[PDB]
Design a protein around this nucleic acid. Structure first.
Lengths: 136, 398, 224, 69
RNA sequence: CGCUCAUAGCGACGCUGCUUUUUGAUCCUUCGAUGUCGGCUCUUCUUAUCAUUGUGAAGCAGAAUUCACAAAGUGUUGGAUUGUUCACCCACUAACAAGGAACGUGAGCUGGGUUUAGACCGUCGUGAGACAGGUUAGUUUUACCCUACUGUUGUCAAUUGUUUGCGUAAUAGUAGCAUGAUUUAGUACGAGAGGAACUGUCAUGCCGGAUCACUGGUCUGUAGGUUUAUUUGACAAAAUAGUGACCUGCCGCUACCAUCCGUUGGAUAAUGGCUGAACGCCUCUAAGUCAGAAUCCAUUCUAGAAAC
RNA sequence: CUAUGACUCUCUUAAGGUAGCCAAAUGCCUCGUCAUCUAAUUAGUGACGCGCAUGAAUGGAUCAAUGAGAUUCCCACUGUC
RNA sequence: GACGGUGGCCAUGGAAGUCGGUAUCCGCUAAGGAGUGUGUAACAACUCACCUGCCAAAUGGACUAGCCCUGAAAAUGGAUGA
């Protein structure tokens, strides 16, 4: 999922948004929430959660939203993190805010993205960048 | 039972397993790079002293890597590296069970290092006064002959040699009436040359610049931060009962099981987490620091371009408590073993790595001299801080 | 004529790549071949910058303008700006926009004589934008969306928009712009048309995912 | 490399260090300290523990160059 | 059967083994009392190898899959439900292979089952009562002995020089492993559908060793700031509330809640070849020899001997 | 054929489960069948009921308040992350 | 060297030993199956059975049965007792 995009795992990182946590939709899908079942890629170990990033592609479910979406498995991409992280630049970014954005396994994101997106995510994911309302 | 998880990857490493209080107070390694160099230009080892950490913005050196010319920050371990005073030449000869001390030779001009290991020693005391009884070189003309005899013999007879060097810690900030002695095995050329030139150098004093060039990787050594005895929890990185309802301990559960019907080495236990050896490798070395004759400070800024000021690497307030650089120093890549005021040691790489992001050129931009609720950045916090107070403030805290 | 180019084996050639009436920008991607190709194409014509915009691989969706001015948000460093300036001719104004409230390129489609703005960008900011280019600015969305330059492949010779655009808006968009708007897509019905194909008046670039018919249609639109 | 300002404070962010904050107003803030970010959150322009120089600036106690800033 | 074609892959009726990870059979051991089941924790080992390393077959064109050798070096996951191993789903992953260690692991835990008393039902009982039936509530003691381990002194309670330094290095341990994106390459291959690899680069997951320049965490710095109540006549400035609360908080410790660092040589196994017989040809084998594993042993690192 | 058994024959012992209720603190099979709740539920709740073995003061069914009782889910809860 | 009848009859209208069914004979020769595969549209072409030239003394085979090997995998580190 794709997997051919765009590019790499995208350099330094800090996970934090783990399994269980609910994060905002930041999208014009009828969902408001994205609950994370699990995160792609994270192989893990004994009683460690597959923790999400700010780009790391995520399995999800709309815990509350449009009841044509409600229940089921969903997917998306994580877009901002409640907790901070150091960058390639040697600089920390911070939101108290946290959010994802609903998407298909294809790589395609449906429509527009409301509020500030991570730069890293944009770099990784071209579709996100394309319909980005703001990129920091 | 199977286990049943998978993972249990051996919490820890059995390659540091004896994990005890290390032998040498200084950094020490019983290994050297081998013979394919010139001669005294390649001294191999050196001894430094730690004095803390700063960060330095530079550019990358990698294409396709968030731009090969985009800025990134990185930490750095700055380390006061006083020049050393070689004094003994020592000849090892290779034999049926490794190498042995055939016989040393020592310089006539100096024998104060000997003395320095003496005031701090003895208990009955017959020979503190100034003398000896483990055999050391005195005398002008008669001892000369002996020295000559020694020199030829070692040169002829087998195998490689090292130089008894030592640091000048009196002139360092931390006061110590004993100095740290060291071997710097000599590589390359031929044995005749090697033996010969040590003698010449006794009087002379080697510089860290003499050993390393500004883009060379290091085989870094030291002795880890002495935390003291502590239990199996952060001595091996184990787990615990996070919701907590247990009358035992923070300490782990099974220690072997009824298995070989005894308990094994291979079990994480309560011991100590400090003075251990180890060696971290491939440290880039970012900038060799210059000596400071108590006048100029551009010499410890580095460049004037991109630096764009004149300052020592020492902070705004400086080091009144800790190891204060007045000497030659070294900007490495971030982190070295050992605490902020420790006697490290350095070697050049055992396998001198020729790789990209290792051999390539490094060029710095900003070196920082900041601080928080305490001082600040160089001249900026020096402006606004001094109008308030008359004596309590002098951007010193002294 | 039109050529079907990739980037990181993707269909998107308006994220990594930027292309207008003049001045081509590409970010230093890990792949060099794709960078080279563009340069080869635009030899002694349009200078490629080979500079990661905002220190990053994103370029086409983080920049706006054509060849009167050229726009960049506050995220970019001074150093970054300077390099960009150096790369291109020093006739055009390359200038940083203060008070960031959006990622430019997704909200600023433009022509040689006017511009299509977000809207919802602040008034002062808008004024600055207007100044930098010289051209006008006209507050109108694209039906459904608020991001224009993403869902409107705007050039002088032709303008591509997805089918979700309404009848009336399109009619009045065309009137406003003095160039007709044509309903259509690229990359087998991809919603983001402008990332799919970047348009210069002399040669038109597009992804590999388009069909034989789609490409033809786009060619006919832009007068090539 | 280059310095910038805090944007909740008159004291500059020294080169590197500090922490940003992107609120969801599409408007970035930079920050020197945890003290000041807390202050920002509280929503009181740094005038509430009297080490911080902003307080000094406004009331003008024992300050000629800090007060004019 | 696998079109065709016994053994690419399976394999009938039939026949021989091994295993002790099933359950029985047995009753040797224990009723002067081995604390029974699971889960957590943690190591170790086995290989009957799921992944990865290297190889060889295939109905192996490519892709993916299947079969097999060497090999146990490194991995072997997150959850719902279940007292539960077992079971069954969701999700990731290169893969989520089976096992052993007193059915590993109760002076390591927990007690969810099973284990007494009280008690509800249902079936059975004239009844007291019964249940490999269901339900519910039910005190988990002790290491201050020896050993084993971990670290910490000290010693040949002198081997028949003091005294130290700088050293060696036998013995033992030993560490890094795994992925993806791109480059190759939309290339090779393929009618098309589709669609690789060596090689290069940048990253990432877990593993290990350090460190605190940044960021965050913490606060008896009882460092400042604020304020509750009481006390000291008032202000003042203090005390108590076992640190009164709250904010801020250096130094110090510490976080995938951060940063840095993790090598190169020989020896081979399988296996692929050479020259070349026995067996005038032949054949990697017999004599001989080449290449060749995440393997072994060195280099590296730890420790440093009644060793110098 | 009914789901079931009012019924008719017949035997046992006098009769042969009416109202209701239900995999219930009562259902072996059993993780029953269906619906729901959850991304996923040997759990929960609501339906179904030849019910191994429910049922009318051995009291049947209901239920407000009440409960250091028993269970499920959601929300406040994030070092019981 | 490995043929003539001969492309044996059939199926075919190509299967001409060899996709393939059934008969499977005779000549001539030192010898040559109405043919052992490879190959080919099936042939052609090549090879095999079959024979002979040279070299020059042993060769071939089906079994039995000693030792060895394969078969022959499992749990602390280990056992002809070393």
């Amino acid at each position: 999922m794709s997997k051919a995009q765009a590019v790499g795992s995208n350099y330094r990182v800090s996970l934090g948004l783990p399994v269980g946590a609910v994060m905002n939709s930041a999208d014009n899908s009828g969902a408001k929430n994205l609950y994370v079942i699990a995160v792609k890629g994270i192989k893990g170990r004994l009683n460690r959660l597959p923790s999400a990033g700010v780009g790391d592609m995520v399995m999800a479910t709309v815990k509350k939203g449009k009841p044509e979406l409600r229940k089921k498995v969903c997917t998306g991409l994580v877009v901002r993190q409640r907790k901070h992280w150091k960058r390639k630049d040697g600089v920390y970014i911070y939101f108290e805010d946290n959010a994802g954005v609903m998407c298909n396994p294809k790589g395609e994101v449906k429509g527009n993205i409301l509020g500030p997106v991570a730069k890293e995510c944009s770099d990784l994911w071209p579709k996100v960048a394309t319909n980005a309302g703001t990129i920091v | 039972m199977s286990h049943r998880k998978f993972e249990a990857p051996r919490h820890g490493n059995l390659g540091f397993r004896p994990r005890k209080r290390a032998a040498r107070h200084q950094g020490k390694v019983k290994s050297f790079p081998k013979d394919d160099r010139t001669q005294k230009v390649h001294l191999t080892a050196f001894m430094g002293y730690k004095a803390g950490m700063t960060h330095v913005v530079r550019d990358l050196e990698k294409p396709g890597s968030k731009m090969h010319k985009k800025e990134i920050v990185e930490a750095v371990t700055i380390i006061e590296c006083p020049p050393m005073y070689i004094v003994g030449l020592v000849g090892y000869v290779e034999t049926a069970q490794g190498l042995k001390t055939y016989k040393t030779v020592w310089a006539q001009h100096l024998s104060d290092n000997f003395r320095r290991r003496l005031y701090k020693n003895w208990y009955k005391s017959k020979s503190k006064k100034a003398f000896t009884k483990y055999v050391k070189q005195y005398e002008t003309e008669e001892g000369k002959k002996s020295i000559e005899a020694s020199l030829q013999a070692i040169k002829k007879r087998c195998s490689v040699v090292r130089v008894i060097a030592h640091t000048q810690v009196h002139k360092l900030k931390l006061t110590q009436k004993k100095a740290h002695v060291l071997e710097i095995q000599v590589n390359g050329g031929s044995i005749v040359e090697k033996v010969n030139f040590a003698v010449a150098n006794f009087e002379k004093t080697v510089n860290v610049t003499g050993v390393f060039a500004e883009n060379e990787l290091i085989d870094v050594i030291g002795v880890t931060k002495g935390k003291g005895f502590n239990g199996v929890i952060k001595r091996w990185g184990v787990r615990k009962l996070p919701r907590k309802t247990h009358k035992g301990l923070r300490k782990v559960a099974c220690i072997g099981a009824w298995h070989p019907s005894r308990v094994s080495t291979t079990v994480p236990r309560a011991g100590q987490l400090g003075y251990h050896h180890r060696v971290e490798r491939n440290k880039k070395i970012y900038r060799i620091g210059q000596a400071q004759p108590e006048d100029g400070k551009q010499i410890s800024t580095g460049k004037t371009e991109f630096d764009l000021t004149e300052k020592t690497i020492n902070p705004m307030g400086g080091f009144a408590h800790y190891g204060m650089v007045k000497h030659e120093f070294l900007m490495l890549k971030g982190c070295v073993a050992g605490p902020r005021k420790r006697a490290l040691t350095l070697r050049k790489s055992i396998t001198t790595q020729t790789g990209r992001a290792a051999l390539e050129k490094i060029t710095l931009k900003f070196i920082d001299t900041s601080s928080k609720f305490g001082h600040g950045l160089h001249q900026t916090a020096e402006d606004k801080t001094k109008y308030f107070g008359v004596k309590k403030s002098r951007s010193t805290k002294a | 004529m039109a050529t079907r180019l990739q980037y990181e084996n993707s269909c998107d050639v308006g994220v990594f790549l930027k292309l207008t009436n003049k001045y081509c920008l590409v970010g230093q991607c890990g792949s060099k071949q794709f960078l080279h190709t563009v340069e080869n194409r635009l030899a002694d014509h349009i200078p490629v910058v080979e500079t990661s915009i905002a220190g990053t691989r994103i370029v086409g969706r983080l920049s706006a303008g054509n060849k009167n001015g050229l726009l960049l948000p506050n995220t970019c460093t001074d150093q970054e700006l300077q390099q960009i300036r150096n790369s291109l001719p020093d006739d055009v104004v390359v200038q940083r926009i203060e008070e960031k409230f959006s990622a430019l390129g997704n909200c600023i489609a433009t022509n040689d004589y006017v511009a299509l703005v977000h809207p919802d960008i602040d008034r002062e900011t808008e004024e600055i934008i207007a100044d930098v280019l010289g051209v006008e600015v006209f507050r109108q969305t694209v039906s459904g969306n608020v991001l224009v330059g993403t869902y409107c492949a705007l050039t002088n010779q032709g303008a591509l928009v997805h089918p979700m655009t309404s009848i009336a808006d399109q009619d009045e968009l065309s009137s406003l712009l003095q160039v007709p708007l044509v309903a259509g897509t690229v990359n087998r019905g991809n919603e983001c048309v402008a990332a799919g194909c970047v348009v210069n008046d002399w040669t038109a670039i597009v992804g590999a995912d388009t069909t034989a018919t789609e490409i033809s249609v786009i060619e006919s639109i832009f007068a090539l | 490399m280059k310095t910038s300002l805090c944007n909740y404070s008159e004291f500059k962010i020294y080169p590197a260090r500090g922490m940003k904050f992107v609120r969801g107003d599409s408007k970035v803030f930079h920050f020197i300290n945890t003290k000041v970010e807390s202050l920002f959150f509280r929503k009181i322009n740094p005038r509430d523990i009297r080490w911080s120089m902003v307080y000094r600036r406004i009331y003008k106690n024992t300050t000629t160059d800090v007060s004019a800033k």
